[PDB]
Design a protein that fits this description.
This is part of a larger assembly, with chains A (425 residues), B (54 residues), C (353 residues) and D (442 residues). With 353 residues, chain C is α+β, with helices and mostly antiparallel strands. Chain C is built from 8 helices and 16 strands. The longest helix of chain D is centred in the last third of the chain and has 21 residues. Chain D is globular, with a radius of gyration of 21 Å. The chains are: A alpha/beta (425), B alpha+beta (54), C alpha+beta (353), D alpha/beta (442). The structure holds guanosine-5'-triphosphate, phosphomethylphosphonic acid adenylate ester, guanosine-5'-diphosphate, calcium ion (CA) (3 copies), chloride ion and magnesium ion (5 copies). It is classed as cell cycle.
Chain lengths: 425, 54, 353, 442
């Protein structure tokens, strides 16, 4: 359980994916040219989980960049760390997917997918022991959502015994590009429910609210949203990237986090909430904030449900004793919110290296039944349109039938019902 | 309180004190179990690949 | 905010403690099967002591002492007294008792019981004995009817000398027993509630018909039903200490403290210090407290006799408020402080020799 | 002289093994490079220490030990660290990907592919033995390898070495240091399948060790290193009789004979004293009476439970240091009259006592102060069943919802194995109760 293969798909997937690589390259001491320049050897101990070594001891991200139009990947290539990616790992078409899941999954994307799997295979074959895959994408567009879920199905078919992990950006009318986002997301969720082992639900609703209410950003840009996301992503992958005991690989994480195969959608949280401050944060403050609804990246109220399982990760130099004391304090004082039929369902890791700019940070990953609020929201937006068959011609024109819409809706409502069931058990 | 079986050597000693008297599956079977588990994995995988084929 | 769980819904004492804890606004009640609690108000049977004190970050306390059943079981108590050196066969305050298993079960003491029963056949001495199990009582000077009655039943019984010369309240020429409440805390301080109660018989005692068990059994249940004078002298049948004391001063020229309470305190401390090494939670990973009800008889020479110890007592209606408050005061808040003139007497005595 | 082979399985078993062999080397004056000056028969012998170490013509003393883990990172540190020279490469066996805290994956999926190699490696060691006694097997209950691979190994050991004895040192799961929510499942599964194949098993609850470290070594937040150094002292106390001249527990068979009258009830409680911090500026040395008395304190036990509320079937006291029999017997006399120590009717009330005059060895720069005398009590008490009840309850909570069960079925295990294992544990708890307890608004 060593190598992870990273894939980023579509505009959103590639913009957040790029930022991820910038952020962890920095943590691991890797410069844009792929040269290591760090001071601590904790940085290189597990560098091979995410990077291949080339000659000259250059480190190259095990990353594959996918899109059905070249625009965002041109931007990526010109971005800060653009030259660090393997040039052959840029796999793109010309036509785009028009914010259309059917185009991503069945027509434009079907034409491109084999060339992507060709690159995925080349990366997998030089893995000493591939643990699995991580995909960044949005669910609201066409390429990330439609072609991203197509890739997942094909990856599963070729590597059925490997873990599949996604960072999936959920659409919100508050931060929206087109009205068909609920369709694309519903169709996509159906795929994720069956073909991923772990999905971090990143809700653009929450990212916007955080930027607006908490960081005092009057006019949040995608760039501001992505600052929060890359911080969360660095956070939730800390245990995979550095020496440690708990949730140190994708399979152990899934085993600790997923009691029932379909309930694998996680609410991530981060503290302290930061924007592009010298306030020392105390272990008690990190802990209170990491559990605060306002620090959650999926726009669900944790008090409206119960936690099946939780992973907490603390970074920086701090007292292990105080960390243990504080985590026990939150559980003991809000014990009603943690299901009693999974004993000791909260696990805590600490890593001495904090992220850039901070002395101390904490990242929260919860499997809460309150995540149903996210899927209900999407379900209501979907039905409002679908009951009048509005905007469906964009999909039937690519060969899809209404029945597939009816099935994706039924399956997502089923998932909602399954969370409600364990919320009352 | 009776001391018994006192044994002494250069490195130490031992004894007993009493305060009061009294008031396997074969290789074949294991292999079958391991093979049956393997076949169950194979069947579940075949079912998945069939579903993906559809 | 402290947390607790209720697992005995049928306990009046702890239903009241529960209420008081809530009213402090600093105690929250969990579902009975949530393990993240500070305090367990336990069930009476098969309390899972083995699952206590394994919750990191929680000091855990429970309202029973594992092992206390030794005191609080008829047959257990008899054995404990006869085989414990500090209690001994030479214990002057416990009525001659023997443990007797039914014939269908068959260790047993039937053999030795008859040995002394004879010296009272011969001796001419009052040879009346009572039989009871831990309903189900028979009083007679004929052993044959005792042992017979026991075999008719299916569980272990105990045969104990019936005190034929009890102290009688006047007017009434009537029996009574004394109940005393004792709280033992996590530190094994022994606290005697300063208020006890006499459960009185409302019918005149009579030593010719030992089968008319309404003037022989002072139980408040057997008095509220089978007795026709229930409530005539007191409400009922319950005389409290201030009055019993005034009575002792007026009729016998003595006080409650001197003639009786000294002996009670001596008995309580002797019983509880006996079992301390077997039940103390001093160096244990969870801690215990318990409320006991000791029941005493007083003979006509003003000698006190221990009848039994109850491990799960109720209290007298008008006494719950104070007693229950006292329990959260000394047993609960002592371990879990909130943000006098005690109602208790601390039983302690350090004679040097 | 009869040889014993040690087998370390998974991270916990490997890291604990590291610590025990380090301590053995210190106790026997064996240097990191494997040389042993005080050993004058070069290249061979049948001294007591030869029970655990073999010899080369170059004068190298080599642990009769096999290390097995389904991933390489932990064993790689043995290959690279201070005692790298001690171990022959063939003794250190690693796979590529681990059991992911999943018994079924450790037992069925990955176990099947590595089990034959492990056995053949053990056979190599066995072939070097003139008269093999059997095996000492170190593993966690909670890990996928420690639980799942060990139970497979134990079954096959009974098949390939049917007459040999098998002892376990097992790490029972504590949330304060655990790495998986499913450890209760893995614990029951492994106990169920290993039960008939183990002759005597010494359970160590990480909760107990963790707290002994906080309380008596003043360690704020104990690590595995702190835990394993303490655990290695207790393991050394238990195996010292196999490695030094003496007359008590001198072979593996004697452990069963002295501590296990009923074969399913084979889990003695270990209690150890004294544990004193090396940072303790001023320390008054404890007497035979004091350390013996401390053996009856739950706070010093390897598993927190209450022996007053159970019964004893057997009791062995193992002393190291300045101890003579008369002081032991005076200490016991006094203790008998101040404590609740009840034996089952069909056993004598008594103690088997061993004294080795060499006081405990501690690791230079460790957390433990050196003391003039110490004792490990091994008692077979029904009170240890409290630990099974705790575990069985956590198992019941999750299993009733089938939480996490799909991880195991997905590895080819049948759900039915959950209920069989659970049912075996229920029988186990009931046995302890029959041996241990008498039948017992007012
Ligand atoms: N005392 C002690 N416990 C340990 C140690 N390492 C792991 N554990 C405990 O063992 C359990 C985890 O099992 P591991 O031994 O780490 O797992 P494994 O056998 O390597 O199995 P997989 O990693 O799942 O393949 C948890 O309860 C840990 O607290 C150790 O060095 N000492
Ligand atoms: N050895 C004895 N001598 C004289 N009277 C006795 C006696 N034993 C019991 N009694 C009388 O019997 C009654 C006690 O009954 P018993 O001891 O069985 O209590 P109990 O178990 O029925 C209800 P509780 O536990 O609330 O006291 C007393 O009220 C007393 O009047
Ligand atoms: N957080 C975030 N969301 C984005 C970004 N770009 C697009 N989105 C969201 O993603 C969805 C549109 O999908 P997009 O990735 O642009 O289309 P695609 O190229 O076909 O995959 C909408 O919900 C947008 O709100 C981005 O950079 N960050
Ligand atoms: Ca084309
Ligand atoms: Ca030699
Ligand atoms: Ca055998
Ligand atoms: Cl053999
Ligand atoms: Mg777009
Ligand atoms: Mg091709
Ligand atoms: Mg009574
Ligand atoms: Mg009673
Ligand atoms: Mg491991």
């Amino acid at each position: 359980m060593r190598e992870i293969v990273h894939i980023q798909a579509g505009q959103c997937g590639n913009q957040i994916g790029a930022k991820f690589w910038e952020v962890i390259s920095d943590e691991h001491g890797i410069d844009p040219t792929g040269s290591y320049h760090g001071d601590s050897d904790l940085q290189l101990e597990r560098i091979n989980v995410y990077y291949n070594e080339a000659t000259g001891n250059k480190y190259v991200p095990r990353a594959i960049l996918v899109d059905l139009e070249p625009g965002t990947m041109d931007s990526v290539r010109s971005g800060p760390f653009g030259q660090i990616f393997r040039p052959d790992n840029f796999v793109f078409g010309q036509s785009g997917a028009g914010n259309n899941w059917a185009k991503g999954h069945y027509t434009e994307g079907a034409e491109l997918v084999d060339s992507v799997l060709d690159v995925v295979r080349k990366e997998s074959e030089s893995c000493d022991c591939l643990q699995g895959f991580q995909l960044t994408h949005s669910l609201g567009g066409g390429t990330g959502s439609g072609m991203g879920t197509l890739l997942i199905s094909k990856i599963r078919e070729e590597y059925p015994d490997r873990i599949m992990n996604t960072f999936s950006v959920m659409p919100s009318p508050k931060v929206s590009d087109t009205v068909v986002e609920p369709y694309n997301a519903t169709l996509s969720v159906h795929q994720l429910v069956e073909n991923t082992d772990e999905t971090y639900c990143i809700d653009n609703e929450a990212l916007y609210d955080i930027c607006f209410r908490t960081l005092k950003l009057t006019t949040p840009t995608y760039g501001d949203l992505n600052h929060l996301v890359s911080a969360t992503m660095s956070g939730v992958t800390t245990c995979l990237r550095f020496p440690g005991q708990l949730n140190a690989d994708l399979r152990k994480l899934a085993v600790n986090m997923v009691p029932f195969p379909r309930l694998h959608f996680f609410m991530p949280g981060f503290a302290p909430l930061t924007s592009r401050q010298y306030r020392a944060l105390t272990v008690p403050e990190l802990t209170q904030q990491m559990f605060d609804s306002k620090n959650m990246m999926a726009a669900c109220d944790p008090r409206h449900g119960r936690y099946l399982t939780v992973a907490a990760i603390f970074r920086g130099r701090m007292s292990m004793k105080e960390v243990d004391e504080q985590m026990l304090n939150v559980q003991n004082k809000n014990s009603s919110y943690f299901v009693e039929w999974i004993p000791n369902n909260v696990k805590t890791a600490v890593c001495d290296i904090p992220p850039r700019g901070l002395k101390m940070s904490a990242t929260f990953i919860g499997n809460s039944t309150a995540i149903q609020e996210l899927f209900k929201r999407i379900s209501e937006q979907f039905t409002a349109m679908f009951r009048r068959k509005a905007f469906l011609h964009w999909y039937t024109g690519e060969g899809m039938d209404e029945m597939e819409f009816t099935e994706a809706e039924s399956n997502m409502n089923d998932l909602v019902s399954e969370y409600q069931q364990y919320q009352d058990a | 309180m009776e001391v018994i079986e006192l044994n002494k050597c250069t490195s130490g000693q031992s004894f007993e004190v009493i305060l009061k008297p009294p008031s396997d599956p074969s290789l074949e079977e294991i292999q079958k179990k391991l093979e049956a588990a393997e076949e169950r994995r194979k069947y579940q995988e075949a079912e998945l690949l069939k579903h993906l084929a559809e | 905010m402290y947390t607790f769980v209720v697992r005995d819904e049928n306990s009046s004492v702890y239903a009241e403690v529960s209420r008081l804890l809530l009213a402090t606004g600093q105690w929250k009640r969990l579902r009975k099967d949530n393990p993240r609690f500070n305090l367990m108000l336990g069930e009476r049977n098969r309390l899972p002591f083995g699952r206590l004190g394994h919750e990191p970050g929680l000091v855990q306390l429970v309202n029973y002492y594992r092992g206390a059943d030794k005191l609080c079981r008829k047959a257990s108590l008899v054995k404990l007294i006869k085989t414990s050196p500090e209690l001994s066969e030479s214990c002057t305050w416990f009525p001659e008792s023997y443990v007797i298993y039914p014939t269908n079960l068959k260790t047993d003491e039937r053999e030795v019981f008859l040995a002394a029963y004879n010296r009272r056949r011969e001796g001419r001495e009052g040879n009346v004995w009572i039989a009871k199990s831990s309903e189900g009582i028979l009083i007679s000077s004929e052993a044959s009817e005792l042992l017979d009655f026991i075999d008719e039943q299916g569980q272990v019984h105990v045969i104990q000398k019936y005190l034929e010369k009890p102290l009688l309240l006047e007017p009434g020429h009537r029996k009574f027993d004394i109940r005393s409440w004792v709280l033992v805390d996590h530190l094994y301080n022994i606290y005697l509630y300063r208020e006890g109660v006499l459960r009185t018989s409302s019918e005149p005692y009579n030593s010719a018909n030992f089968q008319d068990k309404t003037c022989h059994l002072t139980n408040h249940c057997i008095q509220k039903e089978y007795s026709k004078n229930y409530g005539r002298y007191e409400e009922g049948n319950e005389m409290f200490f201030e009055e019993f004391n005034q009575y002792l001063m007026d009729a016998l020229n003595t006080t409650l403290e001197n003639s009786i309470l000294l002996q009670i305190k001596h008995i309580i401390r002797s019983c509880l210090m006996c079992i301390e090494p077997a039940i103390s939670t001093k160096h244990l990973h969870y801690q215990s407290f318990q409320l006991f009800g000791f029941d005493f008889m007083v003979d006509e020479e003003l000698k006190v006799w221990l009848i039994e110890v109850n491990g799960a007592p109720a209290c007298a209606q008008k006494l719950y408020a104070e007693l229950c408050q006292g329990i959260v005061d000394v047993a609960i808040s002592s371990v879990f402080p909130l943000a006098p003139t005690s109602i208790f007497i601390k039983l302690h005595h350090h004679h040097h020799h | 002289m009869r040889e014993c082979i040690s087998i370390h399985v998974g991270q916990a078993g490997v890291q604990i093994g590291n610590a025990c062999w380090e301590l053995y080397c210190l106790e026997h004056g064996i240097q990191p490079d494997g040389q042993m000056p005080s050993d004058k028969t070069i290249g061979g012998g049948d001294d007591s220490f030869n029970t655990f170490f073999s010899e080369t013509g170059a004068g190298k003393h080599v642990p009769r030990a096999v290390f097995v883990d389904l991933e390489p990172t932990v064993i790689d540190e043995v290959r690279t660290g201070t005692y790298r020279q001690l171990f022959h490469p063939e003794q250190l066996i690693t796979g590529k990907e681990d059991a992911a805290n999943n018994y079924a994956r450790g037992h069925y999926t990955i176990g099947k592919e590595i089990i034959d190699l492990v056995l053949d490696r053990i056979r190599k060691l066995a072939d070097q033995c003139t008269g093999l006694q059997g095996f000492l097997v170190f593993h966690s209950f909670g890990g996928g390898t420690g639980s799942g691979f060990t139970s497979l190994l134990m079954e096959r050991l009974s098949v390939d070495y049917g007459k040999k004895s098998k002892l376990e040192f097992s790490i029972y799961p504590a949330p304060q240091v655990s790495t998986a929510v499913v450890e209760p499942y893995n614990s029951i599964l492994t106990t169920h399948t290993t039960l008939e194949h183990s002759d005597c098993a010494f359970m160590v609850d990480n909760e107990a060790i963790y707290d002994i470290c906080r309380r008596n070594l003043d360690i704020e937040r104990p690590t595995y290193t702190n835990l394993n150094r303490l655990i290695s002292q207790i393991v050394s106390s238990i195996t010292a009789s196999l490695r030094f001249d003496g007359a008590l527990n001198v072979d593996l068979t004697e452990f069963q004979t002295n501590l296990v009258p009923y074969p399913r009830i084979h889990f003695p409680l270990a209690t150890y004293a004294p544990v004193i911090s090396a940072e303790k500026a001023y320390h008054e040395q404890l007497s035979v009476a004091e350390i013996t008395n401390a053996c009856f304190e739950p706070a010093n036990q390897m598993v927190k439970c209450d022996p007053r509320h159970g019964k004893y079937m057997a009791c062995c006291l193992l002393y190291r240091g300045d101890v003579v029999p008369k002081d032991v017997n005076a200490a016991i006399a006094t203790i008998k009259t101040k404590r609740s120590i009840q034996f089952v009717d069909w056993c004598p009330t008594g103690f088997k006592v061993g004294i080795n005059y060499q006081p405990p060895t501690v690791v230079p720069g460790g957390d433990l102060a050196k003391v003039q005398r110490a004792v490990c009590m091994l008692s077979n008490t029904t009170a240890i069943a409290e630990a099974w009840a705790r575990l069985d309850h956590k198992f019941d909570l999750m299993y009733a919802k089938r939480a996490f069960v799909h991880w195991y079925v997905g590895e080819g295990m049948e759900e039915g194995e959950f209920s069989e294992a659970r049912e075996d544990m229920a029988a186990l708890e009931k046995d302890y109760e029959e041996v241990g307890v008498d039948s017992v608004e007012e």
